[PDB]
């Protein structure tokens, strides 16, 4: 009988080797997630279909931003095999009211508050 899967908490305990590989920092966890759907919910259980809709990931390859909190992570763990999770990076800090119209989310996962579309000098 196929049923909902409960993953052991060990799977989600990052080791010292993982930190070097992925570049995370356990002392300072990232605040927000970048979540994109990269797998179809077709041929998947209905509970996974519901989680995808709740998270706002019905459209594939569409970045959604979510809080890195236990309750949200519990939902992501259910559909972890259908999504890509990448920490949101703010190299220039949060966008201010002036910068709201000039932001851009790059593929690296960084949100830049200035988007000139010009070449960088030298």
């Amino acid at each position: 009988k196929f049923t909902r899967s409960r993953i052991p908490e060990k799977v989600f305990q990052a080791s010292p080797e993982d930190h070097e590989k992925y570049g995370g920092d356990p002392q300072n966890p990232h605040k927000l997630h970048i979540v994109t759907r990269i797998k179809s919910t077709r041929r998947r259980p209905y509970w996974e279909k519901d989680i995808i809709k709740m998270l706002g990931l019905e459209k594939a390859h569409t970045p959604q931003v979510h809080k890195n909190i236990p309750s949200v992570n519990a939902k992501l763990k259910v559909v972890k095999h259908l999504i890509r999770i990448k920490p949101l990076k703010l190299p220039q800090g949060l966008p201010a009211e002036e910068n709201m119209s000039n932001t851009c989310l790059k593929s690296t996962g960084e949100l830049v508050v200035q988007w000139h579309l010009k070449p960088v000098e030298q």
Partner: protein, 94 residues
């Protein structure tokens, strides 16, 4: 083709994503007057601003929640000290 290489350079995997090729104006008036913003670019500006505002909203909500929890803990410590000794002990102790 070239999707993985473009990502390595920090560019969008698809060359039709973000960057001058897509976002810059296709045309302008011959005299130099700028053209009106293209419909696709206007939609992207709206979508990006909505994404940025959500980023700020979620960040502030987490920060405000973190501060509120800290205050509750500090108050609990103060509450413990509130009733340390209302009345001086006077029985069997000198």
């Amino acid at each position: 083709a070239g999707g993985q290489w473009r990502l390595q350079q920090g560019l969008a995997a698809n060359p039709s994503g973000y960057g001058p090729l897509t976002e810059l104006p296709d045309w302008s008036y011959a005299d130099g007057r700028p053209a009106p913003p293209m419909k696709g670019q206007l939609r992207r500006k709206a979508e990006r601003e909505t994404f940025a505002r959500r980023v700020v909203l979620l960040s502030q909500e987490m920060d405000a929640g973190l501060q509120a929890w800290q205050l509750r803990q500090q108050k609990l410590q103060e509450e413990q000290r509130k009733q340390e000794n209302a009345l001086k002990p006077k029985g069997a102790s000198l």
